[PDB]
Amino acid sequence: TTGERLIRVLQDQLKTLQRNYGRLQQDVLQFQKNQTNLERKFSYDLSQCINQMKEVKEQCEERIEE
Amino acid sequence: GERLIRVLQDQLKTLQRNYGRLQQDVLQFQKNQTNLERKFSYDLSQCINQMKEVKEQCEE
Amino acid sequence: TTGERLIRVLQDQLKTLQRNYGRLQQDVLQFQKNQTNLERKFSYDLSQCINQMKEVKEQCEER
Amino acid sequence: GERLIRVLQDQLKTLQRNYGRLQQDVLQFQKNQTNLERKFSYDLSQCINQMKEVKEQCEERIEEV
């Protein structure tokens, strides 16, 4: 003992370390995998806005009674 | 005897501090990206709904 | 004029769209800023990892 | 008359290309984000992998004395 006691605190610090880091990994995995559906949603909405803009232009240009 | 263990104990407390900085950098980035996305998705929706309104103004 | 009332509505709406574009441009600029910032932080954290690794290495196996 | 209509047409068309560039800048930013995430995962893992080599090294050495 006395040196076994210190070694036990060291084992404790290491497994607290390891468990925290493992928890962070799956938090990063959670976030990043969930990011994909959002990136696709923005991409879609930006294209649609660009397409509606194109329909707007054609129709307003048609609105010529001048 | 050999207090390499007390050195290691010191290094693990430093490594725990540095993990703490890494965890807060990652989590802060994630929190800001989610808040900015709420705004980004609001502004995209606004382009869409505005463009719907212009179409019907030009269709009457 | 029916046409001159629509012209005023179209010019008001063009201003709102230009505003919308600038908010979208500022949104994308902020993604760029948050990202490069994280790249700078992560660069520092990685260096702290490698260099404390290197030194625990020499601390052990050489007493 | 169509002077104001001229410039409404001009401003709209310049806006349409600015949204176009906007769209290309989002696709590119998204993609670089993905690549930075992946290189950063790889580089931290290489550091952790060397960390673990030093653990085994330093646990072999604690009880050698």
Swiss-Prot record, chain A:
Subcellular location: Golgi apparatus, cis-Golgi network membrane
Residues with glycosylation annotation: N34
Induction annotation: Up-regulated in response to viral infection. Induced by the E1A adenoviral protein.
Job description of the protein: Unknown. Cellular response protein to viral infection.
Subunit structure: Interacts with DYM.
Family listed: Belongs to the GOLM family.
Protein name, UniProt field: Golgi membrane protein 1
Organism taxonomic ancestry: Eukaryota, Metazoa, Chordata, Craniata, Vertebrata
From Swiss-Prot, chain B:
Taxonomy, superkingdom: Eukaryota
Tissue expression notes: Widely expressed. Highly expressed in colon, prostate, trachea and stomach. Expressed at lower level in testis, muscle, lymphoid tissues, white blood cells and spleen. Predominantly expressed by cells of the epithelial lineage. Expressed at low level in normal liver. Expression significantly increases in virus (HBV, HCV) infected liver. Expression does not increase in liver disease due to non-viral causes (alcohol-induced liver disease, autoimmune hepatitis). Increased expression in hepatocytes appears to be a general feature of advanced liver disease.
Induction of synthesis: Up-regulated in response to viral infection. Induced by the E1A adenoviral protein.
Post-translational modification, as annotated: Glycosylated. Phosphorylation sites are present in the extracellular medium.
Glycosylation sites: N32
Subcellular location field: Golgi apparatus, cis-Golgi network membrane
Subunit structure: Interacts with DYM.
Function summary: Unknown. Cellular response protein to viral infection.
Protein family according to the UniProt entry: Belongs to the GOLM family.
Name of the protein: Golgi membrane protein 1
Gene name tied to this protein: GOLM1
Parent sequence residues shown: 113 to 172 of 401
UniProtKB/Swiss-Prot annotation, chain C:
UniProt name for this protein: Golgi membrane protein 1
Full protein stretch here: 111 to 173 of 401
Tissue: Widely expressed. Highly expressed in colon, prostate, trachea and stomach. Expressed at lower level in testis, muscle, lymphoid tissues, white blood cells and spleen. Predominantly expressed by cells of the epithelial lineage. Expressed at low level in normal liver. Expression significantly increases in virus (HBV, HCV) infected liver. Expression does not increase in liver disease due to non-viral causes (alcohol-induced liver disease, autoimmune hepatitis). Increased expression in hepatocytes appears to be a general feature of advanced liver disease.
Inducing or repressing factors: Up-regulated in response to viral infection. Induced by the E1A adenoviral protein.
Post-translational modification: Glycosylated.
Subcellular location: Golgi apparatus, cis-Golgi network membrane
Family indicated by similarity: Belongs to the GOLM family.
Organism: Homo sapiens (Human)
Sugar-modified residues: N34
Reported function: Unknown. Cellular response protein to viral infection.
